[PDB]
Ligand binder design. Structure first.
Ligand code: ADN
Length: 262
């Protein structure tokens, strides 16, 4: 249990969330309620999902001062987020749940999130194409949202003191930017190519053909056929996986899905 104890980083997170009294905020983790209090002050209402019932006295004290806090006791990975009406998410995330929670939240949808991650995880999220930290996580996030690191957060800001830095990350979903033909196929396509990130897209797809439910020979012939559709496709699939931009991977998988359909 890491608790964010530096009010200055609370402030930075809240300021970045651009809150008004029309906003409804989901917070993951109660902690000592320091972030919770700031959210309650500035938002219409705050939902807090907290797993540890020993923290109830913090919740209880807060609810005496604020009438717009609702506590949900449970695991945030299990809570049905469809049943909650919020537009923003602000949280010092338990790092253990970083990846699954991020995608469950984006799936549900929101206007804006400002979330604490471990610094290396944050770097991967925001990494530019063709760089050393660019990978599946980068494309999976950036294809669905604009993301940026607001601030690096030192271990001294938490208690107990962590081993590594954290980072505040701002996430603005953008449902219109890249346009995805089929989410399931896109997820499988991403999983296949990034299993071989230093190979050409062509070779990655053949090596990991079973992820897309084709055999290796089938996949070879498919890609021979696919490459002959246009010159843009040829140059994309011949390029190393990690060098393709998010835009290019989305378009490529879109064109590939339709090719496989037709
Ligand atoms: N899976 C989880 N769901 C909800 N809250 C959690 C989970 N794991 C840890 N927490 C809580 O989040 C906070 C981490 O800062 C702590 O209050 C901790 O109890």
């Amino acid at each position: 249990q890491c608790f964010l104890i530096d009010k200055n980083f609370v402030n930075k997170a809240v300021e970045s969330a651009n809150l008004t009294k029309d906003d409804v905020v989901l917070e993951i983790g109660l902690g000592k309620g320091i972030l919770t209090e700031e959210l309650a002050k500035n938002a219409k209402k705050v939902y807090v999902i907290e797993i540890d019932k020993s923290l109830e006295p913090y919740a209880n004290k807060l609810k005496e001062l604020y009438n717009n806090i609702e506590i949900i006791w449970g695991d945030a990975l299990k809570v049905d987020l469809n049943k909650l009406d919020f537009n923003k998410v602000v949280a010092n995330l338990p790092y253990q749940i970083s990846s699954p929670i991020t995608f469950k939240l984006i799936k549900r949808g929101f206007d804006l999130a400002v979330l604490m991650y471990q610094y290396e995880f944050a770097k991967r999220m925001v990494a530019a194409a063709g760089t050393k930290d660019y990978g599946r996580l980068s494309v999976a996030v950036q294809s669905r949202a604009d993301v940026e690191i607001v601030a690096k957060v030192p271990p001294s800001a938490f208690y107990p003191k962590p081993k590594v830095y954290s980072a505040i990350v701002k996430i603005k979903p953008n449902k219109g930017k890249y346009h995805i033909e089929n989410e399931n196929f896109f997820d499988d396509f991403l999983r296949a190519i990034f299993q071989h990130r230093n190979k050409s897209v062509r070779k990655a797809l053949i090596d990991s053909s079973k992820e897309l439910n084709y055999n290796k020979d089938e996949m070879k012939k498919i890609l021979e056929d696919f490459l002959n559709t246009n010159s843009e496709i040829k140059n994309l699939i011949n390029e190393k996986v990690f060098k393709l931009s998010v835009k290019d991977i989305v378009n490529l998988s879109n064109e590939f899905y339709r090719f496989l359909q037709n």
